[PDB]
Amino acid sequence: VGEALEYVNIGLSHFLALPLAQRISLIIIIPFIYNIVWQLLYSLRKDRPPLVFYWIPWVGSAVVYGMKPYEFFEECQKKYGDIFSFVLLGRVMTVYLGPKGHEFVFNAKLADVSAEAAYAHLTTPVFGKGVIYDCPNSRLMEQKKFVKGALTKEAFKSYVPLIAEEVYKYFRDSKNFRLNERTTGTIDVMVTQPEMTIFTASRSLLGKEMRAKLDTDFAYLYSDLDKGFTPINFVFPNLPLEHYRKRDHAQKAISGTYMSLIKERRKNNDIQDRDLIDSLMKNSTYKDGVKMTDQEIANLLIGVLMGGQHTSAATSAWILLHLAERPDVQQELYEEQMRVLDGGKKELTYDLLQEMPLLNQTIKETLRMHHPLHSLFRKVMKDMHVPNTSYVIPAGYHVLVSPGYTHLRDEYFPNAHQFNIHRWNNDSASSYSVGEEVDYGFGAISKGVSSPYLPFSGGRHRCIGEHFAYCQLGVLMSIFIRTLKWHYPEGKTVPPPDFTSMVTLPTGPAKIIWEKRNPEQKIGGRHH
Numbered sequence: 001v002g003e004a005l006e007y008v009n010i011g012l013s014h015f016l017a018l019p020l021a022q023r024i025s026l027i028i029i030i031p032f033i034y035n036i037v038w039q040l041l042y043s044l045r046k047d048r049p050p051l052v053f054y055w056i057p058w059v060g061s062a063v064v065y066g067m068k069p070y071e072f073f074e075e076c077q078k079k080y081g082d083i084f085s086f087v088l089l090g091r092v093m094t095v096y097l098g099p100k101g102h103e104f105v106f107n108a109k110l111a112d113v114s115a116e117a118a119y120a121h122l123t124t125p126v127f128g129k130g131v132i133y134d135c136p137n138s139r140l141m142e143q144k145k146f147v148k149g150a151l152t153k154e155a156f157k158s159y160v161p162l163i164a165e166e167v168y169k170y171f172r173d174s175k176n177f178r179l180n181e182r183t184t185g186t187i188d189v190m191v192t193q194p195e196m197t198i199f200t201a202s203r204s205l206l207g208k209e210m211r212a213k214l215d216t217d218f219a220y221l222y223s224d225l226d227k228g229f230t231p232i233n234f235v236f237p238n239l240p241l242e243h244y245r246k247r248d249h250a251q252k253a254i255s256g257t258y259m260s261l262i263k264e265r266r267k268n269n270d271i272q273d274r275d276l277i278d279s280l281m282k283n284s285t286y287k288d289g290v291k292m293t294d295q296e297i298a299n300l301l302i303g304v305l306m307g308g309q310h311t312s313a314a315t316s317a318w319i320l321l322h323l324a325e326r327p328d329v330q331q332e333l334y335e336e337q338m339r340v341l342d343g344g345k346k347e348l349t350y351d352l353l354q355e356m357p358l359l360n361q362t363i364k365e366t367l368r369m370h371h372p373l374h375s376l377f378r379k380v381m382k383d384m385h386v387p388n389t390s391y392v393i394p395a396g397y398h399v400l401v402s403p404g405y406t407h408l409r410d411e412y413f414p415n416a417h418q419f420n421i422h423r424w425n426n427d428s429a430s431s432y433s434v435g436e437e438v439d440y441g442f443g444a445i446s447k448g449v450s451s452p453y454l455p456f457s458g459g460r461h462r463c464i465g466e467h468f469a470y471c472q473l474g475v476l477m478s479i480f481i482r483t484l485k486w487h488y489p490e491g492k493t494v495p496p497p498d499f500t501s502m503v504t505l506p507t508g509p510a511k512i513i514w515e516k517r518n519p520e521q522k523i524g525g526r527h528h
């Protein structure tokens with residue numbers, strides 16, 4: 001009776017007096033035991049998707065998910081089906097695989113899920129305050145509208161010869177090529193492509209001043225800011241270490257440079273239609289009348305250039321890598337170049353790029369097999385009912401959607417693990433809406449988000465850099481094809497993806513051997 005409760009207190013007393021050898025042992029085994037008991041109890045709930053069993057509390061399935069996410073998804077899909085949850089470094093992730101998952105997450109109501117609540121911890125320290133995910137959604141919608149204003153057909157027409165010039169400059173001057181001095185050589189594509197991507201993106205979107213600054217020690221700052229863009233920042237966004245200080249310094253230094261150019265252009269009234277800087281200076285006033293600050297404009301520049309940097313560089317690296325073991329595809333692409341550009345006598349233009357279906361299909365196919373973002377997250381803000389199930393996703397959970405996984409399923413893409421650009425025959429468009437449209441604030445886009453092919457997502461958070469990426473990748477690959485042949489070192493093949501980084505770039509070093517199609521061909525212009 002009450003004598004029982006006396007022994008409760010006595011037991012508590014004897015608990016606190018255990019040797020700290022047993023106490024430490026107990027504060028390990030008790031959370032461990034409770035974790036297992038909780039999961040087994042959790043599995044009784046029929047309004048919750050199945051939860052992947054895990055031994056270590058808090059950690060969850062982080063190790064297997066972090067290293068081989070698609071293999072994790074497939075095993076989980078076999079056991080539980082398309083909807084299942086797993087614990088990830090303190091968080092509960094609810095995965096919804098397949099097209100229905102795309103609809104459930106990408107077309108979720110604004111009040112139901114939050115992208116910025118999921119990503120702000122990562123991106124804000126890198127890009128700066130006030131923009132992208134450090135603001136309400138309505139602000140992001142208009143920022144996208146602003147950026148999209150410099151991403152027009154007319155802009156792409158002017159970008160193409162600029163991007164082309166940068167590619168030829170890189171072939172001429174970079175130590176990785178030097179085509180005027182060498183006719184063959186070995187490159188690491190994870191060295192060349194990030195460089196070619198930043199040179200071409202900077203020249204076209206930022207302008208000649210900012211491009212020129214990449215020829216200096218300023219370039220190291222981009223590398224510093226680069227290191228801040230890492231999954232580690234999802235768990236440890238701010239540790240007092242040098243990595244984080246160089247990042248924060250780089251952000252200030254780079255945004256300061258952008259603001260300097262911005263204020264100079266405005267003081268000289270030198271505001272044209274050259275680049276994204278000009279565009280944002282003329283067009284960055286929200287609908288409620290508030291103007292973006294020069295800091296916010298610079299930070300938006302950083303975010304847009306940085307994101308486009310990683311997605312595009314990774315993509316062109318995969319293209320080169322897949323093509324390295326496919327001389328048949330290089331050959332077919334080369335013939336297309338000769339036919340469309342009249343044996344090379346025509347100058348490449350944006351309009352001529354659109355008449356290169358096989359080149360564009362090659363980009364399209366590479367993006368199928370190598371979605372640079374294997375997982376997209378939203379934080380659940382309100383309890384969500386999953387249609388045609390009894391499942392309820394409580395607020396505090398995160399939903400995870402993965403079109404890249406569906407890209408690699410035989411059911412939706414026959415022989416999915418085979419690189420075949422001809423699966424897109426007479427369907428070379430980067431993507432398109434097969435029906436009704438909707439405008440979230442940055443232009444009419446597809447209402448339905450059910451396509452098995454969805455490398456640019458859909459819904460309010462859909463990519464707006466798709467046409468720029470195709471323009472950039474197109475020009476670049478057009479010139480690679482016309483200038484070089486390339487192949488693997490003996491016994492080398494397409495490397496496995498590095499799923500552990502921010503984008504799922506190839507595992508390096510990923511080397512290819514190039515050779516000039518025309519050994520005698522010289523690239524003009526001056527250099528020291």
Ligand code: HEM
Nearest residue numbers: 304308311312315376455456457461462463464465468469
């Ligand atoms: C192959 C190239 C690219 C791919 C595959 C890609 C993919 C994506 C995806 C999947 C999203 C949606 C993320 C989500 O749903 O959470 C997205 C959003 C976005 N991307 Fe891209 N991207 C690429 C290139 C670019 C480029 C070149 C730019 C800029 C020039 C850019 C700027 C943006 C912006 C501003 C968003 C909006 C983010 C949001 O609304 O939350 N992307 N991209």
Ligand SMILES: OC(Cn1cncn1)(Cn1cncn1)c1ccc(F)cc1F
Nearest residue numbers: 132303304306307308311373463465502
């Ligand atoms: O969506 C990203 C952020 N992200 C999400 N998972 C991993 N990285 C990447 N990205 C997508 N297209 C281009 N970059 C992004 C979105 C917008 C942006 F401005 C920067 C940025 F990193």
